[PDB]
UniProtKB/Swiss-Prot annotation:
This is Band 4.1-like protein 3. GO terms for cellular component: cell junction; cell-cell junction; ciliary basal body; cilium; cytoskeleton; cytosol; glutamatergic synapse; juxtaparanode region of axon. One of its GO terms (molecular function) is structural constituent of cytoskeleton. Tumor suppressor that inhibits cell proliferation and promotes apoptosis. Modulates the activity of protein arginine N-methyltransferases, including PRMT3 and PRMT5. Interacts (via FERM domain) with CADM1. Interacts (via FERM domain) with PRMT3; the interaction is direct and inhibits the protein-arginine N-methyltransferase activity of PRMT3. Interacts with PRMT5. Interacts with PRMT6. The keyword Transmembrane does not apply. Expressed at high levels in brain, with lower levels in kidney, intestine, and testis. Detected in lung. It is found in: Cytoplasm, Cytoskeleton; Cell junction; Cell membrane; Cytoplasm. Residues 4-284 form the FERM domain. It comes from Homo sapiens (Human). Keywords: Acetylation, Actin-binding, Apoptosis, Cell junction, Cell membrane, Cytoplasm, Cytoskeleton, Membrane, Phosphoprotein, Tumor suppressor. The chain holds residues 107 to 390 of 1087 of the full protein. GO terms for biological process: actomyosin structure organization; apoptotic process; cortical actin cytoskeleton organization; cortical cytoskeleton organization; myelin maintenance; neuron projection morphogenesis; paranodal junction assembly; protein localization to juxtaparanode region of axon.
């Protein structure tokens, strides 16, 4: 029995190493990672890898690892796949904890945009969770936190984190994590997976996939939103991704909206994440 070494970047930025039999399916590796993390509420999470383009791909738990990574290194990341719309309803604090770590990276990366005040408030709850009660002894008027809070740090943002941290005295890690999530869940890009595409006229749009449905970002105005119930059918052909939308009441025939993706793999990736998110919606 020949086994392949796997390396997984965890959400704290540490590396987990294990071996699986070389013909193992994704689920085998994912189960080992989740046992390592003491994670029971595993359905919200997954593993990603980077292809030659260094584009992120979900490791399909049902398929052989070798037929996915193909020529690439057995190097993965552990990530939230399905962002819970209501994190208070998760059964375990440790689940909310990993979700916070993911969202912290979502924020620092700029995938999840955030006002100055929300950056500072989220940051204050992270500090309360990580270090406990505000201590003047560690924080001078010149203090800069080890914690990454934002895509671009300023002294103003560090000061506001400290100001808000002072107000959280006596808050436990689980409580601070729950407040963090109550705020983060409201942000317009929470749990939105964005894909580059062109509309049928060749105009650059972004397609967002999330729990509630599909978003077509055409410009700062004209954001079209199709709740999952409004989406009849989706499919990809060559570089094209198509969504069929239910007609309005007493209208004949659904509408088709077509999109051009960069290449066939990008169309297939978008199709698969939409199918997977739509099933998630069907279970809610
Ligand atoms: F309702 C949706 C449908 C499809 C994709 C996303 C959403 N987000 C919630 C919302 C409702 C109104 N504006 N934002």
């Amino acid at each position: 029995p020949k086994s392949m070494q796997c390396k997984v970047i965890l959400l704290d930025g540490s590396e987990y190493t294990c071996d699986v039999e070389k013909r193992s399916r994704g689920q085998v590796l994912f189960d080992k990672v989740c046992e390592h993390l003491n994670l029971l509420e595993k359905d919200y999470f997954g593993l990603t890898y980077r292809d030659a383009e260094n584009q992120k791909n979900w490791l399909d738990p049902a398929k052989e690892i070798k037929k996915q990574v193909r020529s690439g290194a057995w190097h993965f990341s552990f990530n939230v796949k399905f962002y819970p719309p209501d994190p208070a309803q998760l059964s375990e604090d440790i689940t909310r904890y990993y979700l916070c770590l993911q969202l912290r990276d979502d924020i620092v990366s700029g995938r999840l945009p955030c006002s100055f005040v929300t950056l500072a408030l989220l940051g204050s709850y992270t500090v309360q969770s990580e270090l406990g009660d505000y201590d003047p002894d560690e924080c001078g008027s010149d203090y800069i936190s080890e914690f990454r809070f934002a895509p671009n740090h300023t002294k103003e943002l560090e000061d506001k984190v400290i100001e808000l941290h002072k107000s959280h005295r006596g808050m436990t890690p689980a409580e601070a994590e729950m407040h963090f999530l109550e705020n983060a869940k409201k942000l317009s890009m929470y749990g939105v997976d964005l894909h580059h595409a062109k509309d049928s006229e060749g105009v650059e749009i972004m397609l967002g996939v999330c729990a509630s449905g599909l978003l077509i970002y055409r410009d700062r105005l004209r954001i079209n939103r199709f709740a999952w119930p409004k989406v009849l059918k989706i499919s990809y052909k060559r570089n094209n991704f198509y969504i069929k939308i239910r007609p309005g009441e007493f209208e004949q025939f659904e509408s088709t909206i077509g999109f051009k993706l960069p290449n066939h793999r990008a169309a297939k990736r978008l199709w698969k994440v939409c199918v997977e998110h739509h099933t998630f919606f069907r279970l809610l």
